[PDB]
């Protein structure tokens, strides 16, 4: 007597938001950008190759200095690399070898890591002693942790395969906010450059925009046909990109609350493992699972170039904050840094 | 290349040495993945071999270290993390052979071992598991023996002649589970009926693992 009425009201509201989305779709970004010149063929050559991992590599993050980077792997080791000199600053052993995410504190003082043990553990890199020690061990998620990202030296927000994103306080050690709006497993995270909003891509083929201070879903962005595997913000902070199994990227906009462009190709049929932007937003480095990575013109959906130096599928890739280089990890236990 | 950078490079070299030592020590370890319906006598086999997150069990039999990942504690989507275990020597699949008269509580519209049959079908011909062999454990032997008198196997499998005897029914069930193998040219299925003596099951797992290792070595050398 009430479930049917609520379902009908929800359907009516969904139809209303779809009509509102279609009302402000007078022009399309795909045809607006015919005036600008094409970016043209772009050649990127692998400058460095960080070797020393002996298992699958599932995560990597770039330090704010854009010279140090942490990398996770399934052999149970966490390695901090010096990209310029390709030497190991640290080699952190992990209690659980099933880690599938890692992050770097913006200050560079701490590093996080998590995985099938559903624990994002924080390691203190700068101690009075000479070793790295586990600063904190956050627990409370139900499913495996797919991503935790450092808000600052004291805050971190994690996404887990229990259809939930949580915001923690490192000192006390328990989450202070919870973001329960998703239906499928949450698989990716991306903090806005001003670190006030973040979007999370789940398995229900939808990306939602939250507010850290409030704790509520501001917007929900749909349009994919499979589970979203990669989430990345536009450098401006007023858009983002999604990557799923349907072999298709999508650029969404926060202000108009609708999709702008899709990056699909007929010959590419396999999904997307990781998606990142460039320093200005003209490039979109989407890492597919056809044993290489692709580069897109973010304003015209034109395939600018490829990065085809990996003997396995790339599972993670990010771009330096200063925009000098691009590093892509893969399942061949090999990390490569491009330019 | 100043003194500081030279010392940093020496530190990196020592890190590499320790990493290589740890990796070569880890390469001597047999990594096994344990799956099943969950209430299929899995704990009995786990405790026989012993003598949130994913549970880990470690033991040695004959100078060989076994690592056994119990992954049943995760209720997320299987495809989202099954590629983590893509490199694994073998998969242990415990099957209970005394639950044809019992149905799952949540749905009660499908038989108990039909769910395990679907799980085996999904696991056997996965994209990642096209090479890893499967060790099958048919646990509830005594319960099957004492329960087949009350009810025959025709209820679970309608296309049955109806011998209603333990040996032929067990052969039927083993053949049915082996029939789900689609890539018959790449992986084998090893089947054992869980015995009272705890050494025999471990010996059978050891033999299956050494067969897998021999085949992998032959493939690496080329002959396979």
């Amino acid at each position, epitope marked *: 007597s009430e479930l049917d009425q609520l379902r009908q009201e929800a359907e009516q509201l969904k139809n209303q938001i779809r009509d509102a989305r279609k009302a402000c779709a007078d022009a399309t970004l795909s045809q607006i950008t015919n005036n600008i010149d094409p970016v043209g063929r772009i050649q990127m050559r692998t400058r460095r190759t960080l070797r020393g991992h002996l298992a699958k590599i599932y995560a990597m993050h770039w330090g704010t200095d854009s*010279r*140090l980077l942490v990398s996770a792997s399934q052999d149970g080791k966490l390695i901090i690399w*010096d990209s310029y*000199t390709t*030497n190991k*600053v*640290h080699a952190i052993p992990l209690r659980s070898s099933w880690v599938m995410t890692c992050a770097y504190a913006p200050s560079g003082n701490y590093v996080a890591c998590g995985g099938l043990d559903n624990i994002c553990s924080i390691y203190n890199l*700068k101690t*009075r*002693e*000479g*070793n790295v020690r586990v600063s904190r061990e956050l627990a409370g998620h139900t499913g495996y942790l797919s991503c935790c990202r450092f808000l600052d030296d004291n805050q971190i927000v994690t996404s887990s395969g229990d259809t939930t994103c949580a915001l923690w306080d490192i000192e006390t050690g328990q989450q202070t906010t919870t973001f329960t709006g998703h239906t499928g497993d949450v698989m990716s995270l991306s903090l806005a450059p001003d670190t006030r909003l973040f979007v999370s891509g789940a398995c229900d083929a939808s990306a939602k925009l939250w507010d850290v201070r409030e704790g509520m879903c501001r917007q929900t962005f749909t349009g994919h046909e499979s589970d979203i595997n990669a989430i990345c913000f536009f450098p401006n902070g007023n858009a983002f990109a999604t990557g799923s199994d349907d072999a298709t990227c999508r650029l969404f906009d926060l202000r108009a609350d609708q999709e702008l462009m899709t990056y699909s190709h007929d010959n590419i049929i396999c999904g997307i493992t990781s998606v990142s932007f460039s320093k200005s937003g003209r490039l979109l480095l989407a890492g597919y699972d056809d044993f290489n990575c692709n580069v897109w013109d973010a304003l015209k959906a034109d395939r600018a170039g490829v990065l085809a130096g990996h003997d396995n599928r790339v599972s993670c890739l990010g771009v330096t904050d200063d925009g000098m280089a691009v590093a892509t990890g893969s399942w061949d236990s090999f990390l490569k840094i491009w330019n | 290349l*100043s*003194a*500081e*950078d030279k*010392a*940093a490079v*020496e*530190r990196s070299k*020592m890190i590499d040495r320790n990493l290589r030592e740890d990796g070569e020590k880890a390469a001597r370890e047999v990594k096994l993945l344990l799956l099943g319906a969950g209430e299929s006598g899995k704990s009995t086999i786990v405790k026989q071999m012993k003598i949130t997150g994913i549970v880990e069990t470690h033991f040695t039999f004959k100078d060989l270290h076994f690592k056994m990942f119990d992954v049943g504690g995760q209720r997320s989507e299987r495809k989202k993390w099954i590629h983590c275990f893509e490199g694994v020597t073998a998969i242990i699949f415990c099957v209970a052979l005394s639950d044809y008269d019992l149905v799952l509580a949540e749905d009660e519209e499908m038989n108990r071992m039909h769910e395990s049959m679907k799980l085996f079908d999904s696991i056997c011909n996965n994209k990642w598991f096209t090479d890893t062999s499967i060790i099958l454990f048919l646990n509830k032997k005594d319960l099957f023996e004492e329960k087949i008198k009350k009810s025959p196997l025709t209820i679970c499998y309608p296309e049955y002649a109806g011998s209603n005897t333990y040996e032929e029914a067990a052969a039927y069930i083993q053949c049915q589970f082996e029939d789900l193998n689609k890539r018959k040219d790449t992986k084998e299925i090893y089947t054992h009926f869980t015995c009272a003596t705890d050494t025999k099951n471990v010996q059978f797992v050891f033999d299956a693992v050494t067969d897998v290792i021999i085949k992998n070595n032959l493939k690496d050398c080329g002959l396979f």
Partner: single-chain antibody
Amino acid sequence: DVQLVESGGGLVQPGGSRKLSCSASGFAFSSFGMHWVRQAPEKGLEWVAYISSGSGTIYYADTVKGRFTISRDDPKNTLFLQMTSLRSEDTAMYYCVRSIYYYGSSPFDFWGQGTTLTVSSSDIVMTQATSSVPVTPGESVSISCRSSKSLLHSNGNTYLYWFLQRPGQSPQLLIYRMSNLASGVPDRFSGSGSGTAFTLTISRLEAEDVGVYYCMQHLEYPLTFGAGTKLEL
């Protein structure tokens, strides 16, 4: 709290032999590279010997090469200095100094208490203009030290370290690579330099800010210190 205790010495007849031992328990010792730095009475510091992490690299000073032998026992967390054929100019307070080398580290971070020893009776050189300057408290004071050759490398960082020795205390690191303020010191200190001529600036003096300041190069061995600069309130 880290500690570096050391025992040995007290009296040696000329031409003898003595062994100095350093003990650093409770904290990492295998990763840290260890140095010996001596300081003759009423004289500036002088690097003596260095051993790397894992004992895989050992250096000695020009005036001690062949007569001294530095060894470490990582399982026991001990550092040794086998001294043979001790002269009458070897009388000095010997210090145990730890140093860790990776990208962004702070070597020469912690100095031991120092054990005395009395024996009864080409390379970049630094230069400090003054050795005694009186400044009233609350006023800024600048201390500058030059070098024989420029310390700025292709890496982009120039290797210059600043140490302060309080009266009757071990020297402590406050600035490394001319800019990085070492952890544990107040923010009133600051450092700058241009290739060859460097300096150090204090925002305001304090009762504990008076002492002797040394500047050291780390571009390549042997490490050369500078003549001490005494500050009197």
